[PDB]
Design an enzyme around this catalytic site. Structure first.
Site, PDB file in Angstrom:
ATOM      1  NE  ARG A  55      -3.979   1.981   2.369  1.00 36.86           N
ATOM      2  CZ  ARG A  55      -3.930   2.865   3.361  1.00 36.86           C
ATOM      3  NH1 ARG A  55      -2.988   2.780   4.292  1.00 36.86           N
ATOM      4  NH2 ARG A  55      -4.847   3.826   3.438  1.00 36.86           N
ATOM      5  CG  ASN A 129      -4.858   7.016   5.356  1.00 38.74           C
ATOM      6  OD1 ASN A 129      -4.574   7.776   6.295  1.00 38.74           O
ATOM      7  ND2 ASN A 129      -4.882   5.702   5.488  1.00 38.74           N
ATOM      8  CD  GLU A 130      -6.257   6.606   9.196  1.00 37.34           C
ATOM      9  OE1 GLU A 130      -6.046   7.697   9.766  1.00 37.34           O
ATOM     10  OE2 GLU A 130      -5.687   5.548   9.542  1.00 37.34           O
ATOM     11  CG  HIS A 195      -6.962   2.156   8.632  1.00 38.86           C
ATOM     12  ND1 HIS A 195      -6.437   3.390   8.312  1.00 38.86           N
ATOM     13  CD2 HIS A 195      -7.097   1.490   7.460  1.00 38.86           C
ATOM     14  CE1 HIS A 195      -6.262   3.466   7.006  1.00 38.86           C
ATOM     15  NE2 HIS A 195      -6.655   2.327   6.465  1.00 38.86           N
ATOM     16  CE1 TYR A 197      -2.231   1.011  13.497  1.00 38.47           C
ATOM     17  CE2 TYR A 197      -3.965   2.245  12.369  1.00 38.47           C
ATOM     18  CZ  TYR A 197      -2.679   1.719  12.389  1.00 38.47           C
ATOM     19  OH  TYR A 197      -1.841   1.918  11.311  1.00 38.47           O
ATOM     20  CD  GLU A 225      -3.093   2.930   7.968  1.00 41.57           C
ATOM     21  OE1 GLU A 225      -2.944   3.192   9.183  1.00 41.57           O
ATOM     22  OE2 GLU A 225      -3.168   3.820   7.094  1.00 41.57           O
ATOM     23  CD1 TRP A 254       1.928   2.639  10.452  1.00 43.07           C
ATOM     24  CD2 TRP A 254       0.892   2.957   8.491  1.00 43.07           C
ATOM     25  NE1 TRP A 254       2.255   3.898  10.008  1.00 43.07           N
ATOM     26  CE2 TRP A 254       1.632   4.120   8.807  1.00 43.07           C
ATOM     27  CE3 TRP A 254       0.156   2.925   7.298  1.00 43.07           C
ATOM     28  CZ2 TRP A 254       1.656   5.242   7.972  1.00 43.07           C
ATOM     29  CZ3 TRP A 254       0.181   4.039   6.468  1.00 43.07           C
ATOM     30  CH2 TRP A 254       0.928   5.183   6.810  1.00 43.07           C
TER      31      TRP A 254
HETATM   32 NA    NA Z   1      -3.228   5.397  10.204  1.00 43.21          NA
END
Ligand code: NA
Ligand SMILES: [Ca+2]
Ligand SMILES: [Cl-]
Ligand SMILES: [Cl-]
Ligand code: NA
Length: 446
Positions: A55, A129-130, A195, A197, A225, A254
């Site tokens: 990516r 992205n996001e 993503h 996290y 991610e 990531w």
């Molecule tokens: Na991020």
């Protein structure tokens, strides 16, 4: 994250490559936009890990130096030349709620379309992205419902990838409005990304439920991610990797290198070349369910007994299995039980049976196990240290009439006090095809 203070096509929950073969992303994120001169070194380094996708972080000039069309073409070339699928993404709208920032990203893809049209079999477009940092599914959907049509009208036919709202950590946005966003694509070739996290992947339950909540909408998903931890908490990378393998969900770790001080622990490699991976990098590349074990390139490019299995599967797992593993009495070399699993053989296909568990085999100098199948070859292996360093014997022929004893000399293995995994790698022959079963029993060390 936010401050501490003819080509690819989607069919249901599966992303298929241009040849009609399911493609499961197993790759790495590379922050190209901030380190433009590292393009060749980084992408070749990422290819060497066994990753099947990279990516690439691009800038549309909103916050950093805009990546011009020649740069975009060069990045795609580097990916292709190294048999890597390229997921391109515009990073300048990260965390923004403004439609202006999203439109700038869309305008960028349109401006660079000549470098994307015709690359449908190797390039996937992650719109932004996001985008949309707020946790509002409806507003998030409204943005993409207008963006997707614009991209298609401009002639882009690549599979599109859409990041969930909430800086990618609000998968509920996809569960609630993902179908509406998908239906806004006249080509119905859009997939979604989470993503994972500290909020979306904080524990095993969250990882599983968040993945299930996207898939049950019959939408294709990728964990675009993820890390081993983040700003405000731990991330269950182990479950992300094991469950993604179980459900055929792609993932991209990531990130290669270059994170700021606040997130330096997320660098996968100490050097841009990738000759010295960090512990995080080794978890991704060499750990269980990692790149070495599960990554397959797009087809477009191509004496004490430790385990007797008499009462249970004793914590064993595996990969590339059709069903299993189970403890059975159908066959055994010691006692009345053995560990069994079913597999689908294909030319030189590899399959795994392994027990992921920390332990010390210090003092031990040898390990062996007896295996068989219902031609094939196999070898016993162990992984040690924070680097999950691989040690295995040589591949030897096994049969279906009786058990074959595999062995591994531990006299030269380093960090035996830190064994992380023990397993057997089964490998089909060149002309091997069809269904069969694999067995393992009497794993002993001396
Ligand atoms: Na991020
Ligand atoms: Ca047994
Ligand atoms: Cl499902
Ligand atoms: Cl499944
Ligand atoms: Na973790």
């Amino acid at each position: 994250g936010r401050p501490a203070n003819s080509g690819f096509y989607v069919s249901g929950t599966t992303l298929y490559d241009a040849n009609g073969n399911p493609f499961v992303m197993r790759g790495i994120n590379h922050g190209h936009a901030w380190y433009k001169d590292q393009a060749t070194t980084a992408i070749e380094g990422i290819a060497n890990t066994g990753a099947n996708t990279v990516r690439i972080v691009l800038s549309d000039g909103g916050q950093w130096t805009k990546d011009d069309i020649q740069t975009v073409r060069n990045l795609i070339s580097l990916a292709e030349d190294n048999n890597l699928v390229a997921v391109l993404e515009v990073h300048d709208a990260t965390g923004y709620d403004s439609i202006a920032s999203l439109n700038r990203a869309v305008d960028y893809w349109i401006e660079m379309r000549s470098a994307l049209i015709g690359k449908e079999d190797t390039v996937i477009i992650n719109i932004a992205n996001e985008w949309f940092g707020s946790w509002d599914g409806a507003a998030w959907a409204d943005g993409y419902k207008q963006a997707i049509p614009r991209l298609r009208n401009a002639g882009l036919n690549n599979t599109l990838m859409i990041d969930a709202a909430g800086w990618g950590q609000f998968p509920q946005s996809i569960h609630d409005y993902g179908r509406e966003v998908f239906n806004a694509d006249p080509q119905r070739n859009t997939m979604f990304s989470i993503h994972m996290y500290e909020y979306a992947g904080g524990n095993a339950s969250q990882v599983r439920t968040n993945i299930d909540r996207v898939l049950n909408q019959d939408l294709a998903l990728v964990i675009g991610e993820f890390g081993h931890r983040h700003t405000n908490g731990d991330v269950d990378e182990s479950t992300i990797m094991s469950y993604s393998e179980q459900r055929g969900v792609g993932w991209l770790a990531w990130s290669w290198k270059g994170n700021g001080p606040e997130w330096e622990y997320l660098d996968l490699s100490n050097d841009w070349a990738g000759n010295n991976l960090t512990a995080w990098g080794n978890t991704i590349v060499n750990g269980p369910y990692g790149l070495r074990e599960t990554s397959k390139l797009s087809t477009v490019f191509t004496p004490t007994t430790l385990y007797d299995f008499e009462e249970s599967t004793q914590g064993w797992t595996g990969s590339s299995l059709s069903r299993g593993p189970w403890t059975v009495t159908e066959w055994s070399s010691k006692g009345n039980h053995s560990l069994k699993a079913d597999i689908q053989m294909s030319s030189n296909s590899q399959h795994y049976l392994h027990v992921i568990q920390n332990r010390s085999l210090q003092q031990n100098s040898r390990i062996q196990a007896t295996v068989k199948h219902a031609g094939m070859t196999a070898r016993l292996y162990v992984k040690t240290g924070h680097g999950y360093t691989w040690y295995s014997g040589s591949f030897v022929p096994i049969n279906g009439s009786s058990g074959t004893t595999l062995s591994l000399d531990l006299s030269n293995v380093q960090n035996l006090s830190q064994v992380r995994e023990i397993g057997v790698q089964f490998q089909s022959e060149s002309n091997s095809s069809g269904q069969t079963s694999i067995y393992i029993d009497n794993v002993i060390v001396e």
